[PDB]
Structures are given as C-alpha cells and as structure tokens.
Amino acid sequence: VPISFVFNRFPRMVRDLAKKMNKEVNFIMRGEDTELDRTFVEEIGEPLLHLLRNAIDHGIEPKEERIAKGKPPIGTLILSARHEGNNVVIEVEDDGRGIDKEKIIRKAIEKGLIDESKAATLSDQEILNFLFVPGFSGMDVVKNVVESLNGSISIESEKDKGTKVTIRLPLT
C-alpha cells in the first residue's frame, strides 16, 4: 500500500497530543505516496506514533520557551518516507530541545552500565544507543518492532537543535 494508509491518521493524533500538551506544532508530512508491503504498513504505525509522541512531549518546547531561546516560535515536526534502493526510509525530525547526552551518561553510570572513565571517550552514537537498552527510559519497544520487520533504526540528536529518528525497512 501507499504508506498514506498509516500517515493519514497522524495529523489528527498530532494536533490531539499538541492540544493536550499545550504545544504549538507545525506538522509536515512528505513522501506519503511511498509504497511498501502490506505487512510493513500494518505494523509500522505503532512505532511511528511513539516517535511522534516523543517529539511533541519531550522534544518541541512550548512557544514561550522557544521565543526565549531565540528559536522560531512554533516547533516543527516532519514525518517523511522515501525509497532508497530496495529499502524504504522513514524519518521523524523535530527542531525541539534534543536529547541531553550528558543526562544519558549520568543515568548510565547510575545504572552501573559504564564507569566515568569510559564515558569520556564514547561516541555520539554509542551514547544515544543507551536509549535502546530495555528500561533505560520506551525506545526499546520501538526498536523491537522495527527489528521484527527486519529493519534498523538510528537516532541523531543535539541539545537545543532537535532530533532525527530514521527507520530503514527492507523490501520483504
């Protein structure tokens, strides 16, 4: 099917969550005509809804805070799909407050998953990959579904700039 069968549900879910959270959100959908196998279409909805929720709750800041930080007042959330070879790539991007890598390291140390000495040299991707650890605090459940579809997921984020989650699905 076109992924529009999934993506057409999201503007409703996104305004509803924005109203509940007192966030002003500019939601943009691109690539909705991108076609993929029915099994992916019937399963990819729940993971995507989780990522959109995360963007609106934890990423986009309220307008007053964005103005105070010198950002464009209304936060933007972009959900896109495209073909890459025989794969489909789906991205959820926001221009919100990002993921705080220092907080992740602190939590990791508190949980005994790494010591201070080793935290100093972790890469960005190694740090963000703690988010997929079960119970870390979720992104594990999103990963579980994606992996069940033989997909991969990655996260890029920077503090104050925003977050991009990318899901790559096979042709299957």
Ligand X SMILES: Nc1ncc2ccccc2n1
Q: Is the Cβ of residue 99 or residue 105 nearer to ligand X in the bound state?
A: 99
Q: Which of 55, 105, 142, 146 binds ligand X (CB under 6 A)?
A: 55
- The size of the interface with ligand X (CB under 6 A), counted in residues, is 8
**Residue nearer to ligand X on the CB measure, 51 or 88:** 51
CB 100 within 8 A of CB 91: no
Please give the single-letter amino acid code of residue 70: G
Q: Is 75 in the site for ligand X (CB under 6 A)?
A: no
* Closer Cβ to ligand X, 34 or 163, answer by number: 163
Compute the distance between CA of residue 63 and CA of residue 55 in angstroms, rounded to an integer: 14
- From residue 110, how far is each of 107, 113, 114, 164 by CA, in Å? 5, 8, 9, 26
Q: What is the dihedral of CA 150, 89, 39, 145, to 10 degrees?
A: 50
Return the amino acid letter for 17: L
| Smallest separation, CB 99 to ligand X (Å) | 5
Q: Which of residues 31-50 bind ligand X (CB under 6 A)?
A: none
**Using CB under 6 A, which of 25, 99, 105, 169 touches ligand X?**
99
Name which of 45 and 59 has its Cβ closer to ligand X: 59
- Taking CB under 6 A as the rule, does residue 163 contact ligand X? yes
d(CA 11, CA 17) in angstroms, rounded, equals 10
Q: First CA to last CA across the chain, in angstroms?
A: 13
Q: Can residue 54 be called a binding residue for ligand X (CB under 6 A)?
A: yes
Structure tokens at 14: 């996104």
- 61 near ligand X, judged by CB under 6 A: no
Within 139-158, the residues that bind ligand X by CB under 6 A are: none
- Spatial separation of the C-alpha atoms in residues 104 and 15, rounded to whole Å: 29
Residues in the site for ligand X, rule: CB under 6 A?
A: 54-55, 58-59, 94, 96, 99, 163
